[PDB]
C-alpha cells in the first residue's frame, strides 16, 4: 500500500464515496510503506551516530527514534477512495501531516548541528588520508595524534572534544580501531557503523570497485534511454525537440566559407565593383562589394537568430587607402532584385538597410599593434527574423564597411568585415535548417555521410548537421564511457559492426567465382577501428568518404548493440584491466605507507 489512509464517512461499510481521507487536526495520516522507513531510518541513523557529540555540547535532545513520529492506525490506504479500497491495512504505521513536519524539521535542525561538527571532524580526518585501496598500512597512533595536535588550526572542534569526536569518528573510519578496554589491544576487524556499505566500496582486487563499475553503467543506461540515443540514425522525420537542442550558439568566420560548403551563405561573384549608395543618418555612404567575391550571409535559410558579427583584431588598412578610414563599419542587409550570383551592377540591388552601424568612423575603432592597425574589439549585431524577410526572394546580410566616399585607393580593397568572427545564435529552437531550407523535423539517416569534410565544420548553429552531431556526441560518450572501445577486447560495440561487415562483404561475394572466402581476423580488426574511429571523433560519421562508419547499416547497428550491451554489463565490468589497475593501487598504498612512516618518526 501507499498514500494517505482512508476510513469511510457515513459509517458502517465503506463504499466508494463512503470513504474520505481521515483528516485529523494534526493532519492526514499518510502510510509509511516498508522502503520509505528505510530512508527516514537511514537519515536518523546517520544522526544518532553523532550521539557523543550532542551530549558533550549540551545541544541535541536524546537519540531520535523514528517511532516517535509515527502511529499505529488502521484502515484502507490508497491514493483515492476507489483504489484505497483494495489495501485494507491493519495497524499499519502511518505518520500524520503535522508529524511529517517534525520528522522533517528535526532531521533538518539536527542535520545542521551535525553538518557543522561533521565538518571539523573531517578537516582533521582526511587530514591524514585514512583511506588506502590495496593491502593495509598502519601509522603508530601516538605519533599520529601528537602530530594532528599540531597541524589542526586553533578553531577546529577536534581539539576541544578529542575523544568526543574520536567516538563519533570510530564509527565512520574503519581505519581508526579503538583499543579494547579489557585486553588493551586493537581488534583486527574494524566495526564502523557503516559496516556493509564500507565493505562494498573497498576497491575489490578482483574487479575495480562494485560501487564504481555499477554506476558507470546505470549512468550510461540513463543517457541511452534519455536523450534518445536509440534511434540515432532513424530514417524518418523527427521533431527537432526530439534532439533537445540547448545552449547552442556556434560562431564562425564567413567571407571564407565557400558558398557550396554551406547553403546559408551566397556570394556576389561579379566582374567589376558594385558601388551602391544609401542615406544612413543623413550622411550618404557607399556600400562597396569590392574586387573579390564578398561572401554574404544569405537571409533565407537563416532560422530567425541573433547574428552578432564581431570585428576585432582583424586588420584595418586605413593607413594605405585613406578611403577606408572615415567609414563607419556596419552590418547591413541587401535586398537584390535578380538573385545574387546573377546580380551584376548597382541597378540590380533593390535597397540596402543599415541594420546596425558602428558609431564613429574607421580611425577611432583602430589601434596600432605594430604598423598594421587592428580593430578595437566591437560587436555589430542584427536580430534577423524569419518573416521580416517574407516574400522578398533575395536578401543578404553583409557586414561591410559603408564608405563615406569611394575612391581609386579602395579599388582593390573590398571592405567586407566578414573576415571577423561572426556568432549566430538560433533564437527559436523549434525550427532547424537543412541544406538551405528551414524545417521542423530532421531525417537523421539523411545527414549521415552526406556532408563533406567542411560541409560539417561550416554547419549553421542548430541545423540538422549540428543537431545530428550533438546527438552522436552523446552516444559517443556512452560508448567511450561504459563500453571498452579502447582496448583489444573486441567489445560489444566493435562487435555489432563486425557482424554488419560480414553480412555485407558476404553477399557482395555471392554470384561470381567467390574466390575470396570472407576474412574475419581482418574484419574484426577493420570494424574495431571503425567503432573506435567513431568514439574518437563522433562527427566523422557525417562526412562522405569515411570507411565503414558511413554505410547505412552501422550506427543504426552500433547504437542498438551498445544499447543491449549496457543493459547487461553485470556489476564487475571493472574486471577489465583490473590487474594493472590493482597493481597501480598497491603502488599508491606503498607510497602512502611511506608517508605514515614519516608522520611516525618526525612527530614521535
Amino acid at each position: 500500500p501507499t498514500g494517505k489512509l482512508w476510513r469511510p464517512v457515513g459509517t458502517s461499510v465503506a463504499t466508494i464515496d463512503s470513504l474520505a481521507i481521515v483528516s485529523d487536526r494534526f493532519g492526514q495520516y499518510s502510510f509509511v510503506n516498508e522502503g520509505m522507513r528505510e530512508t527516514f531510518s537511514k537519515a536518523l541513523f546517520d544522526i544518532n551516530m553523532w550521539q557523543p557529540l550532542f551530549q558533550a555540547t549540551k545541544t541535541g535532545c536524546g537519540p531520535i527514534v523514528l517511532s516517535s513520529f509515527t502511529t499505529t492506525t488502521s484502515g484502507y490506504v490508497g491514493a483515492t477512495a476507489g483504489d484505497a479500497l483494495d489495501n485494507p491495512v491493519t495497524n499499519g504505521v502511518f505518520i500524520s501531516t503535522v508529524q511529517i513536519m517534525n520528522l522533517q524539521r528535526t532531521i533538518a535542525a539536527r542535520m545542521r548541528d551535525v553538518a557543522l561538527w561533521q565538518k571539523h571532524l573531517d578537516t582533521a580526518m582526511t587530514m591524514l588520508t585514512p583511506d588506502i585501496s590495496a593491502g593495509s598500512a598502519s601509522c603508530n597512533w601516538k605519533s599520529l595524534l601528537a602530530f594532528a595536535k599540531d597541524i589542526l588550526p586553533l578553531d577546529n572542534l577536534c581539539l576541544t572534544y578529542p575523544n568526543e569526536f574520536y567516538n563519533v569518528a570510530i564509527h565512520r573510519y574503519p581505519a581508526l580501531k579503538p583499543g579494547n578496554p579489557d585486553t588493551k589491544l586493537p581488534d583486527a576487524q574494524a566495526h564502523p557503523l557503516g559496516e556493509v556499505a564500507g565493505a562494498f566500496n573497498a576497491a575489490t582486487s578482483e574487479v575495480g570497485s562494485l560501487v564504481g563499475s555499477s554506476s558507470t553503467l546505470s549512468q550510461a543506461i540513463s543517457t541511452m534511454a534519455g536523450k534518445d540515443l536509440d534511434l540515432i540514425e532513424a530514417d524518418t522525420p523527427l521533431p527537432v525537440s526530439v534532439f533537445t537542442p540547448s545552449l547552442a550558439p556556434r560562431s564562425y568566420r564567413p567571407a571564407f566559407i565557400k558558398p557550396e560548403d554551406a547553403k546559408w551563405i551566397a556570394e556576389f561573384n561579379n566582374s567589376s565593383l558594385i558601388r551602391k549608395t544609401l542615406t544612413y543618418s543623413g550622411a550618404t555612404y557607399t556600400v562597396q562589394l569590392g574586387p573579390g567575391p564578398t561572401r554574404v550571409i544569405d537571409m533565407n535559410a537563416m532560422i530567425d537568430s541573433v547574428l552578432t558579427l564581431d570585428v576585432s583584431g582583424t586588420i584595418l588598412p586605413y593607413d594605405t587607402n585613406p578611403d577606408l578610414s572615415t567609414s563607419v563599419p556596419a552590418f547591413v542587409l541587401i535586398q537584390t532584385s535578380v538573385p545574387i550570383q546573377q546580380v551584376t551592377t548597382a541597378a540590380n540591388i533593390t535597397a540596402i538597410t543599415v541594420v546596425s552601424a558602428a558609431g564613429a568612423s574607421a580611425i577611432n575603432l583602430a589601434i596600432n599593434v605594430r604598423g598594421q592597425p587592428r580593430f578595437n574589439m566591437l560587436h555589430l549585431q542584427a536580430t534577423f527574423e524569419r518573416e521580416t524577410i517574407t516574400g522578398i526572394p533575395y536578401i543578404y546580410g553583409l557586414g561591410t564597411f559603408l564608405i563615406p566616399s569611394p575612391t581609386s585607393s579602395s579599388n582593390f580593397s573590398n571592405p567586407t568585415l566578414m573576415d571577423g568572427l561572426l556568432t549566430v545564435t538560433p533564437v527559436l529552437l523549434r525550427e532547424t535548417t537543412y541544406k538551405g531550407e528551414v524545417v521542423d523535423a530532421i531525417v537523421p539517416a539523411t545527414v549521415m555521410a552526406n556532408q563533406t569534410s567542411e560541409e560539417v565544420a561550416s554547419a549553421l548553429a542548430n541545423d540538422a548537421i549540428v543537431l545530428v552531431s550533438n546527438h552522436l556526441n552523446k552516444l559517443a560518450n556512452v560508448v567511450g564511457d561504459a563500453i571498452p572501445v579502447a582496448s583489444r577486447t573486441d567489445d560489444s560495440a566493435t562487435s555489432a559492426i563486425v557482424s554488419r561487415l560480414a553480412v555485407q562483404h558476404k553477399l557482395s561475394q555471392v554470384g561470381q567465382a567467390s574466390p575470396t572466402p570472407p576474412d574475419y581476423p581482418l574484419l574484426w580488426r577493420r570494424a574495431k577501428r571503425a567503432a573506435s574511429m567513431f568514439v574518437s571523433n563522433p562527427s566523422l560519421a557525417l562526412q562522405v568518404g569515411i570507411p565503414v562508419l558511413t554505410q547505412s547499416g552501422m550506427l543504426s547497428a552500433l547504437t542498438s548493440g551498445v544499447g543491449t550491451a549496457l543493459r547487461t554489463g553485470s556489476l564487475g565490468k571493472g574486471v577489465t584491466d583490473a590487474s594493472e589497475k590493482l597493481r597501480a593501487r598497491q603502488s599508491l598504498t606503498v607510497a602512502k605507507q611511506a608517508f605514515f612512516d614519516q608522520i611516525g618518526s618526525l612527530w614521535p
Binding site: 501507499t2 510503506n33 520509505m36 530512508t39 537511514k42 537519515a43 541513523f45 546517520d46 551516530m49 557523543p52 551530549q55 558533550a56 591524514l128 588520508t129 585514512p130 583511506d131 588506502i132 585501496s133 590495496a134 593491502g135 593495509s136 598500512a137 598502519s138 601509522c139 603508530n140 597512533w141 599520529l144 595524534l145 595536535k149 578529542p162 575523544n163 568526543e164 574520536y166 567516538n167 570510530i170 565512520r172 573510519y173 574503519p174 581505519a175 581508526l176 580501531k177 579503538p178 583499543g179 579494547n180 578496554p181 588493551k184 589491544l185 586493537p186 574494524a190 564502523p192 557503523l193 557503516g194 556499505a197 564500507g198 565493505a199 566500496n201 573497498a202 576497491a203 593501487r585 598504498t589
Partner: protein, 41 residues
C-alpha cells in the same frame, strides 16, 4: 587528549588504539540518501 572517562566508551589517548587503514573497508557514512520525489514516494 586529556583523559575524559565515561562520556564516550573510548578514550582517544586510550591504551592500545591504532590508526591502520585497510584497503578492505573504505570508511563511509551515509551521503547518498535518496529523497527525490518519485523515489521517496
Amino acid at each position: 587528549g586529556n583523559v575524559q572517562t565515561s562520556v564516550n566508551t573510548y578514550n582517544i589517548t586510550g591504551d592500545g588504539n591504532s590508526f591502520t587503514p585497510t584497503s578492505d573497508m573504505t570508511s563511509t557514512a551515509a551521503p547518498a540518501i535518496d529523497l527525490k520525489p518519485g523515489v521517496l514516494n
